Design a protein around this ligand. Structure first.
Ligand SMILES: CCN(CC)c1ncnc2c1ncn2[C@@H]1O[C@H](COP(=O)(O)OP(=O)(O)C(Br)(Br)P(=O)(O)O)[C@@H](O)[C@H]1O
Length: 349
């Protein structure tokens, strides 16, 4: 009845199979993309032993019960696998290539670790698809666990790396995008640099070094800005490009959308500003007595991190990207299930 494609998102914490049915319009672009099946397994691919028994157990658990035969499959790993040397990755892909050759139910089209730029492309396509803006300047930011992505329209520029630019034609229109991924600036990886910063945690929160939190979002933001700008040079790379290529609307996916959906934060219309984010983080968490807070919200296991995270998002978007602290940032809410793999259907199916 419809075309079908499978995309496996092999992420740092788990792998997620998505089977989509779609139709194609007369520009040769997928439409009516529907997720018909879904399977999620932990831990991440890069966290299992790369031998046949382990890979077989893992992929069987992921795929065996799929209600669909003879479908093309894309196996796309992201930041978790990017953290591994090429020679380690090879062990996984040798086993995986062999496993798929033993299954005629699944036609492996590609298995690879996509670059963060690739992932930025798919992010942009996925968001703009959900927003129905694709047949129509929309910027997308993905705040992931290990890497962060930014992507916005920008005219082809021969003085910028080809790796940071993508040309595509979508619903009949030629598009050029600037794409950038910062590996290490994802919230989990970045957090590992700041666990002993008392400025980044609720008062009396027990830091690993035996010291106590003493939260202050402006100070915590400054510490994080050092990693963004002194180490990753985010400001130098992104700000001159945004000054010249203004974005009309920002959309964010990933961790922002989770934090903004917490009980401790108040945001309407699935949008926020950096100023409000930082202020609420500073008041509700950074300067808050930890034990009292923890007692009031005992189920939220991300709570302890909200001072750091609010400071980190502001640092990234404001001090890094140069986004105005009062500029509206839309976020796709967690309930909505927007997935970057929708971008792969658009681009590759
Ligand atoms: C009550 C408020 N909740 C609970 C919902 C939350 N509050 C704050 N952060 C949350 C969160 N739930 C999840 N996160 C974090 O969101 C960040 C990025 O999310 P993502 O989903 O975007 O991370 P990602 O990069 O795609 C992942 Br799954 Br780590 P993989 O590499 O593909 O496996 C990750 O680092 C998560 O740890």
């Amino acid at each position: 009845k419809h075309s079908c494609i499978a995309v496996i998102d092999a992420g740092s914490t788990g792998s997620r199979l998505h089977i989509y049915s779609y139709d194609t319009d007369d520009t040769n672009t997928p439409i009516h993309i529907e997720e018909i099946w879904n399977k999620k397994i932990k831990p991440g691919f890069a966290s299992i032993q790369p031998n046949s028994v382990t890979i077989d157990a893992y992929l069987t658990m992921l795929l065996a019960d799929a209600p669909i035969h003879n479908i093309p499959v894309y196996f796309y790993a992201t930041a978790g696998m990017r953290l591994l040397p090429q020679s380690q990755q090879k062990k996984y892909y040798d086993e995986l290539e062999y496993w798929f050759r033993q299954q005629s139910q699944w036609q492996l089209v590609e298995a690879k670790t996509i670059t963060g730029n690739d992932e930025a492309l798919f992010d942009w396509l996925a968001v703009n698809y959900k927003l129905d803006t694709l047949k129509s300047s929309v910027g997308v930011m993905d705040m992931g666990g290990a890497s962060v992505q930014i992507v916005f329209p920008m005219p082809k520029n021969a003085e910028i790396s080809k790796h940071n630019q993508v040309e595509l034609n979508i619903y009949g229109q030629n598009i050029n995008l600037y794409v950038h991924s910062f590996l290490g600036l994802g919230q989990t990886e970045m957090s590992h640099q700041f666990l002993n910063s008392p400025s980044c945690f609720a008062n009396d929160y027990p830091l690993p070094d035996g010291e106590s939190g003493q939260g202050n979002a402006p100070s915590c933001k400054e510490e994080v800005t050092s990693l963004m700008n002194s180490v990753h040079k985010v400001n130098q790379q992104i700000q001159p490009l945004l000054a010249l290529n203004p974005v009309n609307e920002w959309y964010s996916i990933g961790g922002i959308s989770n934090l903004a959906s917490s009980q401790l934060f108040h945001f309407e219309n699935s949008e926020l500003t950096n100023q409000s984010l930082l202020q609420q983080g500073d008041n509700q968490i950074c300067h808050q007595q930890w034990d009292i807070l923890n007692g009031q919200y005992p189920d939220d296991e991300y709570l302890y991190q909200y001072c750091l995270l609010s400071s980190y998002y502001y640092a990234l978007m404001v001090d890094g990207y140069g986004i105005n602290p009062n500029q509206t940032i839309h976020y796709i809410p967690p309930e909505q299930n927007l997935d970057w793999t929708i971008g792969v259907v658009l681009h590759r199916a």
